[PDB]
Write a structure and sequence with these properties.
It is classed as de novo protein. The chain is mostly helical. Helices cover about 80% and strands about 0% of the residues. The protein binds cobalt (II) ion.
């Protein structure tokens, strides 16, 4: 989730 979220942002 960490990288999914930061990628999205
Ligand atoms: Co990763």
């Amino acid at each position: 989730l960490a990288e999914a979220l930061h990628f999205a942002l």
